[PDB]
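hey can u run this one w/ alpha-D-glucopyranose bound, need the structure tokens asap thx
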Amino acid sequence: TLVEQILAEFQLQEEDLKKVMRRMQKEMDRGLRLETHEEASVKMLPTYVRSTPEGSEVGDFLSLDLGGTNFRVMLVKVGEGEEGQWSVKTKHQMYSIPEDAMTGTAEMLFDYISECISDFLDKHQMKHKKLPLGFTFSFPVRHEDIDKGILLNWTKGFKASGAEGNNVVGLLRDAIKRRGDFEMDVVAMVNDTVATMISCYYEDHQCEVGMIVGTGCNACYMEEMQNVELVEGDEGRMCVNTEWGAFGDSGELDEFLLEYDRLVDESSANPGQQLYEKLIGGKYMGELVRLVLLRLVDENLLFHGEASEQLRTRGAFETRFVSQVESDTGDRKQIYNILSTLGLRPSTTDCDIVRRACESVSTRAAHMCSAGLAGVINRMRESRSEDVMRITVGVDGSVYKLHPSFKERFHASVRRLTPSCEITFIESEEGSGRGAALVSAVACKKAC
Ligand SMILES: Cc1csc(NC(=O)c2nc(Sc3nncn3C)ccc2Sc2ccc(F)cc2)n1
Ligand SMILES: OC[C@H]1O[C@H](O)[C@H](O)[C@@H](O)[C@@H]1O
Ligand code: NA
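ok here u go:
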């Protein structure tokens, strides 16, 4: 109970979720209107991907995915299916980004990318060949069009200098021609939320929302063009990138924030930014548990009040440990091994307490996230006039997919928040690469 009292600070009651949900909805309305879009914590970024596309090129596309710790390059075949296009990933390669490539400059970093792009084409006897390129770029962009937008700021710990405020598709077309080697048509830059959503479209036309819960956390959804005030027009729909990670940056979550959150935030690459994402994202989840653990050792409640050197270092409680702790079957061997690897020697009760600390943090992430998506879905409910709104959500990300109970918890809570909606969840297969291509495919019918 001294332990359980510390942990019970993580609880959220239903009315707390409803409050977060309504505030999210308010913020979303603000980012859409011209008079408030600029100060809005929830950016609601038009993406220029639009409804009833009809008219796709077929064949082969190059997909890049940048936003993970590791950059990826892959080849995707789009072709012709019934009432839409099929797609399949055929070749792939993943590339690490070195400490020096990151902390450098954007043009530096975008060379490293073009390098990897050459590297990849060499290995597949394709360097001669010229294909449309799908770019999945998982960071907030203000788009002018489907193939043009400026990065607003880096998130999830990225930090290349001289990239913020510049045209990303610009930065890439540049560096692909400090190469001469190869030439791609850069037909479409998308967010990873948008890509996952599109990657599920062929199998389910009701998929109108894309969610990521991985390193970072965010969603996009199909919005009515009359509500998209930042894009001229009233006919049809356009996907909006909510960028809901930055919910709380105007102080909307201040009553919920705990000490561990103010610490994670204060020592992050982006102090004061991405507050909501910091409650949920796998970049921050293990760190939260760490701090909760260090709190517990300080009150002398855990490890006899003695912490290891690993435990006292940032980043050392990896999010994947949280998830592995919660897969422990009851014998404590997974917990013991993780803690032992961290230079600790837990007792039976130290183990049980580490488990509970993990559950506390990841259950609050599930619930917080559930209110976000209930916000998006109930907002869209207003513009639908069926008895039950049947909607499909495409989802990706290792927190959602692999944490043993995250998705169950998430599902039940979202359902509780969204009466008269019947929500179907699809886990995306090669969301990023196959969705970037599918959209490239469609934007080709115009820019080719
Ligand atoms: C201006 C512009 C450039 S690309 C673009 N739109 C797309 O590429 C696109 N958009 C949607 S919007 C939507 N409507 N209801 C729900 N969803 C999500 C849906 C699909 C696609 S591609 C596709 C098409 C068919 C298929 F089987 C698989 C992928 N507009
Ligand atoms: O990768 C998931 C998300 O992480 C961060 O929130 C980014 O700002 C966003 O653009 C992306 O969708
Ligand atoms: Na509009």
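The chain has two domains: 1-46+203-429, 47-202+430-442. anyway lmk if its weird
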